[PDB]
Design an enzyme around this catalytic site. Sequence first.
Site, mmCIF file in Angstrom:
data_model
loop_
_atom_site.group_PDB
_atom_site.id
_atom_site.type_symbol
_atom_site.label_atom_id
_atom_site.label_comp_id
_atom_site.label_asym_id
_atom_site.label_seq_id
_atom_site.Cartn_x
_atom_site.Cartn_y
_atom_site.Cartn_z
ATOM 1 N N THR A 56 0.868 -1.251 -0.066
ATOM 2 C CA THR A 56 -0.074 0.120 -0.152
ATOM 3 C C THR A 56 0.736 1.136 0.174
ATOM 4 O O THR A 56 1.972 1.264 0.502
ATOM 5 C CB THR A 56 -1.060 -0.072 1.051
ATOM 6 O OG1 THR A 56 -1.825 -1.283 1.070
ATOM 7 C CG2 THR A 56 -1.524 1.417 1.263
ATOM 8 N N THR A 57 0.430 2.177 -0.827
ATOM 9 C CA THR A 57 0.958 3.470 -0.669
ATOM 10 C C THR A 57 -0.051 4.556 -0.627
ATOM 11 O O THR A 57 -0.952 4.856 -1.555
ATOM 12 C CB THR A 57 1.815 3.833 -1.749
ATOM 13 O OG1 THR A 57 2.269 5.046 -1.896
ATOM 14 C CG2 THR A 57 1.316 3.522 -3.160
#
Lengths: 60, 219, 195, 208, 225, 212, 234, 225, 228, 233
Positions: free
Chosen positions: C1-2
């Site tokens: 995730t970012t």
Amino acid sequence: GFGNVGEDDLHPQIKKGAIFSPEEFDGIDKTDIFPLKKKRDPDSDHFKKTGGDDDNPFLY
Amino acid sequence: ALGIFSPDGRLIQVEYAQQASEQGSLVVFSSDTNEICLSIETKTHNKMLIDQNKLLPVDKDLNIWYTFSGIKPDSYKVLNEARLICRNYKIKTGTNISFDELAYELSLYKQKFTLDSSMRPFGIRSILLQVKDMAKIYVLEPDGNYSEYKCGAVGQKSVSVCEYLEKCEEEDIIFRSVSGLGTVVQSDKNKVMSYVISKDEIRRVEDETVSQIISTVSV
Amino acid sequence: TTTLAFIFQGGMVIAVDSRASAGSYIASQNVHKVIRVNKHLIGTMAGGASDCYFWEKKMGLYAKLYELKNNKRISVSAASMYLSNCVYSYKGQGLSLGSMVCGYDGDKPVIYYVDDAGQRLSGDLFSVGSGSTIAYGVLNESYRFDLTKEEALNLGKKAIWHATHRDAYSGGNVNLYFMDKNGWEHLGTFDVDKF
Amino acid sequence: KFNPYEDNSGSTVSIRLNNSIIIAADTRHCSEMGIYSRNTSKIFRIGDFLLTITGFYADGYELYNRLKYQVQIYESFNKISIHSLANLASKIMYSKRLFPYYSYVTLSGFEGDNPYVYSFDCLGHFEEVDSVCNGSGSPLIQPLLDSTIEKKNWAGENYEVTEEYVKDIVRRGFNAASERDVKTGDNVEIWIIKKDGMTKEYERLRQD
Amino acid sequence: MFLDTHKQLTLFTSEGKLDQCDNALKAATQGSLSVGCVSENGVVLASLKESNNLVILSEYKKIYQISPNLGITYSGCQPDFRIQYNLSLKISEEYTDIYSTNIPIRLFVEQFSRQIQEYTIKKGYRPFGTLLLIVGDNKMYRVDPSGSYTSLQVGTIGREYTESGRLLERRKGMLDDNISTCVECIREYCGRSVKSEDIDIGVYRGQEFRVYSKEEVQEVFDSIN
Amino acid sequence: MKNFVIGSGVISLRYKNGVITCTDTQASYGNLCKFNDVRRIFRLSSNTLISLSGEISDIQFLMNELNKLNESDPVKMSPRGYLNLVQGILYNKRSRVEPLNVSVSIVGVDDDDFLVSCVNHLGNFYEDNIVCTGLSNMIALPFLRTCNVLDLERDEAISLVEKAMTVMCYRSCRSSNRIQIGVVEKGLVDISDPYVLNTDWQVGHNEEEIVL
Amino acid sequence: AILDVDTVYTNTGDILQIGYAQKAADNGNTAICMKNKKGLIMIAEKPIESKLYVSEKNFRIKKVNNSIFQISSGIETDLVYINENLKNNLISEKHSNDMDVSHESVRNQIVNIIHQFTRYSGVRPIGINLLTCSKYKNEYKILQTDCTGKSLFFKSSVIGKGSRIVKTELEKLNLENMEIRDLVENGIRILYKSYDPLKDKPFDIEIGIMCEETNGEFVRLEKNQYSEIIEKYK
Amino acid sequence: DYTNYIIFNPEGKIKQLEFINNTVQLGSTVVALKNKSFGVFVTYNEKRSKFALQQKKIFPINSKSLFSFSGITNDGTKIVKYLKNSTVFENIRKGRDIHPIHVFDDLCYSACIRTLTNGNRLYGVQGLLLTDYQGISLVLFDPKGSAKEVRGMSIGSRSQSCRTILEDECDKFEEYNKEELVRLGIKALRNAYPETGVLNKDNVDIWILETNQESKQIKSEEYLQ
Amino acid sequence: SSNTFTEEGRLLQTEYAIKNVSKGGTIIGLVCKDGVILLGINKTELLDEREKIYKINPKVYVSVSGLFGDAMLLKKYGQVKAQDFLYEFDYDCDIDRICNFISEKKQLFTQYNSTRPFGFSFIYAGMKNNKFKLCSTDPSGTINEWKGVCFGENEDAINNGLRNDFPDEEMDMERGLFEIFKILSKVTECSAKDHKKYEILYFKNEESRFLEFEEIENILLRIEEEKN
Amino acid sequence: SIVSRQNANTYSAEGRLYQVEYAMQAMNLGTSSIGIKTKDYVLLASEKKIISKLQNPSSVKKHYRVYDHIALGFSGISADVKTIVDKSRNFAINHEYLYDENCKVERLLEHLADLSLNFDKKEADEKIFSRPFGASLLIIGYDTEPRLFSLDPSGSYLEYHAKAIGSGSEVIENMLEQEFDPNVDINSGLKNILNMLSKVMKDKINNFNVEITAITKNECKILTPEEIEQFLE
């Protein structure tokens, strides 16, 4: 307790993905020799040493 | 009977607490958009008695002040809970408690002692007072009721003072408060103090002016 | 995730990746990583999908309760402080969490980076998740407080795109939001393969 | 040292079409190295909604009982919506985060005219999906749905998706799983949830 | 209405007095007489035992030891004294655990009187109906149901307390003779001829308190006769 | 989780108009056969039998709770009622991370419905025409499944179960040849006195060893 | 003023509330228990307050366990609490020892559970007479408990309003070497002998036996077993 | 003295337990008839005002189970929730249906506790449970803590007239058909409510339960208009 | 009765508790230029131990009138709370903190319905802001600051004397005690007749001390001679 | 205490609990208010209890927002109503937490009715007070239909098409049975409700002594004085 679920999906790692994965509860074609978990060969059948003293080995 | 209804549908102990809150030294106040004037009268029969300051700060940076009428020892506990509410709210939330939230929580504390057996209603009319962005005064009943007041009075014979204030719609709130207090007290028997609460600052008024204005009422 | 959130002169930009992973297997590719709690307050969820979503929705209920009994919008500081306290109560128990609780307090934008360790930081630019380091690099040399809205949006959109380009646990659609004094707006769900 | 969980095979697939929901699961109940039963149903129904579980069968049964009890409490006034039921399931699951249910619950049903399928993890996070596979066979079946049903990476003209085509795809995927999945079962349940009703079919799978 | 277990049984009357505390003091005042006499060499403590109900006077005791240096005796109802004696033993043993020394008379009396007074404010509880004489460390303390204590030189509790107290003033002296002097003093307040079985005597000498055995009390009476 | 004195195996299968349950009477403490008369088949009602395996102390505790429940409530229970009750007990114990090292088989008949069910220490449960517990699950179950038990009469079913238990005795360390067979039919519940199976051991005789 | 405001002593030492409880208990429907070497039975009046009640399915006899059952007269709902607690205590006691609860242990439980109602302030005396029949070591005993908690073992006993007439008839009765059906016959006869039609409503009979023919298990007789006797003595 | 709280009056009766009998007579009439194969609930509902909606006195606990009550509606709702929870528990944790009488065991124990001690509030609700269990069974629950099976019963205001009308025909319930039972229930209501116009298509709701079949509400048009 | 209001709007139990105080031994207090006088009148010769005046912490002393058991209970409570304050902040608290502790507990006991008010009053001698102070606490829990006050037997007479017979002139505590004895003798001869029941404290914030009855008699001769 | 709990729970020889009977006298010792339900809208108008004109009109509000689409008016002892409002808000938020939806108004009424008579229960969240609340509530909301509910201190509640509470309740009801028609527009409905209210108000009706809440499918509107001015004429 919480299992660190998502640490890998949360941090750059300088496998805990965002979603919990199955069997969280090797590169060799191994298979198993018996359906018993760890058994591979006959049991070591002998009278096993017990008692005596292990923390005072030299006080015969 | 305590924390229960009477045969005619009255919370008898709550109204007794109201009456006990009426039998207290009279407090009069009046407010405008940017200030409040607060005046208190005290009995001077004892020269050796040192009169306590009845205008106590609830939180100095929010500029919230507390006043009461009725049983004095209950005022100590209610003021302590006001200060505790402010401090605990800042700890839990990280931001200053708003004046309305403080009034609501103090009113809940007041009500707590009227919902249960084995405990006695506070029986003090407590006044919350603040000047940060605008003048705001809350008057909390011993039973937990509370509502903003533009001006009013509480305590011994305060109904007549409120009746006078209804007519005394003078622009100068110092005039209004001191004259309303003068309708009841006797200058010989009552020593009077007056305070003006302004933006994050506080000061008490000169004795000469307050006494002069008080002398013109109830002559 | 970012996930990505930062403040610029014209407002505030938020962007997330929307991939969900369960190890090597990509369980989902279109999960929503932004929890809208009101028109002026949203939170980007990073870390455990369940715990991060759960506490954020538990925070969104506290915001509504505050509004009901105050007739006033909750501040970002109070909303994030409530969230950080809930996770802090489970500090050292393995709870994995990280989220920017961002919004407007009147006319002032503020982003609070809340973390599972109980940490709570207010800042002008945060990036969280596995791809945060890549996003930080793209933002470092391009981010300015004097960005125009279109420049800021493309910077946020492009910074997440690069992170998904290079991170295994980042991918899918670049959800993009623009938070302003007048509330937020969902500006798109751009698919990274169509840039 | 105590291991509170058992893996009892997976391979439950639920796909929502425009006007129907096709949800299928294998009927095998697996031990370690053995088969407890070949006719254990992984699919439970709550009114007009179908619930399916994978992983520890006892955990799924307990979660289904919790859901049914809470739903029949809630139904004192009105029927529960699929969205409300999914949210309640998420809350129930997360209430055990310290001792999670080893169940990948997938809740599917119709909200009036519109089909809905919700997929859950063991810790309760739920999302609305178009096609989801849970359990051991999920990695073997999900790509098939992504390709043939959802038309991912299908650059050209797409074969029209319909109930008879989707059921064929589901049986194909279950055959593939039962071939290459050790714990995928011997028979596959196939429910078809439509606006006004639902029905169940059966097919035989690899039984070795 | 049925018994209100939450009722406050001790309250001020319109005259400022505690209604139930005075009744408890009256109950204590009716108990068997017991006296104490301070001296320049020590303190004496004596009490009378009722011989009715076939009580084994040799085994029944009226003067009790709390610690090596403290003794105690009571006038009032026995059960309340037994509970207060359990409490006092707890107090002294706790002090000995902490400091390892014998509890001083004043600290003991303070800690004891506070827990006695606890029952004048405890809901649904009445005060102990016993007066207590505590002898130790060359001092004497009378403790009443109110939890109020007073150090005394000569003190009496139970029947005939005031007039006996006045007589004790006439019957002080050296500890060695003070025992017989006070035995004569309290012989004026007994309904029957006193045998050694009918009286307990405890004397604080030097650094410890000890209760005379029935044989010693005979020796004291042999001096009397 | 107690692992001190363990009963070996439970075999229960349904046949024509009835149900079987069978267990050995051996209880082992490690490699020591400490007791050979521990009986693990119990009558839950006039139409139900419960056979248990695992830690004997947990077996006794579970049967004590079941007996208390049976004597407490005034309403009869069908075999599935007992199955649900035992599954709930075991699953609650597991979820309190204080599991019983016991696995049981509830068998019974209600109005011509035949129950053959299994519940393991974790509260996991299943129902099948042949259910085996423990190493029986791997040794006797594959052999039993080769026979269509659904068309066997009581005598044939008993003989088949006896053969399975003989195989267990041959190929299990913790299984003895002294078995106890419980049978339940529409109007019958029977638990036989434990009796000893007859073994052969004739395969290893070889040609030139003087049989003694 | 009479000090009956609570369970407290009057100046004469009497607890008036327990007397009122005994007045309530003595006005309940009669139940007769007769004990013999060969078994034990209990008869119970079930007055027909209205024909709408299904008397054949409403039971006055409540079982404590497989070997103990009891019946009460007075405010019979108090038997609900008494029976529930007795059952909870004695089932656990029986199964924690894997043996029957003895008559003396049952008596201890009965007395200690009934006394606390006559002992506390905010509580109301049990207000029932209670007959508890039990089997232990192949012996039967009947325990008649009063409102005070005083419970004694009897060879045969009766509770309820008609106790005064029934007790004399029992005293006229020899129980040794009587068959269980002889006990049923005599119990029905004695119950009807105390009917007093002008004051009490007509009643149905509930009979529970505990004898060798049922290996000591409590059995509730169906009406067809004693309809002939009821016809004989109606 | 004896009216206010839970104690025997000198005559040996508890006045509060008699007052709850008046309390349970407040609600509107419910008339219940049972036959081995099927059972009927007939109710009279009057709008409290011209603008008030009907309160739906009958509550279905489960398919083939109905409950209704008269008195304090809060206690009735509590009992409805209790019966629903018991149905769930018995179906799941015991694999069976609720027993009409024994499903009330815990509730009867709680009610007995309330009747034995002060402070706790007596239940002011009288309930009728009509359920299929080896056939149709009808149970009357009383606030004193007792549940008894009945052939037919009437609860609520003016219920004695309905009760006597039912009782005059109880022996013939096992022969009546469903239409006959509904007719007799409406006749009982009419006897309680002889005033015409009061009973109408709107004020009366009839519930039918048949063994091995679901419970249904059926139109009252054919029986009142 | 108990702790509940009445039609008059007053806690009758607290009023009776306050009335109880006036039956106790007389205690007086007076603030002066260089200290605070704390005076108490016992009912018997009590050189064995101080009984009317006690110490809370190095800079707070209290006088006692009323129920002795409650008085000692709350004296110990106040001492324990002063030590808790020292434990917390590592310095001794002023008179206000002890007043607050005791007033809070007293108010709790006059507000709880199932308990009775403490039937005693305290006079606190101490300092604040580098100036001497003299507080008081009634059974109700009210805190009153005083230049001078009296409680116990002859409370009203001595209070009136302080109101209108005590000079307004600021004076060192020697003349303060002299004037206290003057007004006390004017009110009643028994004060000047006997002195072995007196406990008198010369409170100075760091060097407070008690007066011997020889010093009291030295004051007595001065008062006897000044009027001659 | 046991004695106080018994005093709370004592039944009268006539039936109803004594405390309930007294709370029902207390419940209408307050200012009047009217609630009107129409298939498009539900209204709730109340006259403010302005004890003195120095008490500013804004701060004496009588309608509390229970949730996004639930408003609560009251009559009687006003102290109890803030506790009732807090617990109602908690219930509504808990219902959304469990089910992600706005609760039916009937469900909130059921919850409050259950909590009403739980004086004895030892946990605060499982009871309202140790006594009946001395207030009568008109709870309105939108749950796929305009809903008007009245909750009495007895714990009973009824869904109404129209109801009035307070000292003018009986008069306003005798006027409602003649004047009320649900086939009327929201603005004319506001006119009618204000006309009915003005009949009982101590002083002349204006936009500063009146508070109006109108809940519709579109909004849970609270009318400003500048909006009440439109309907006062």
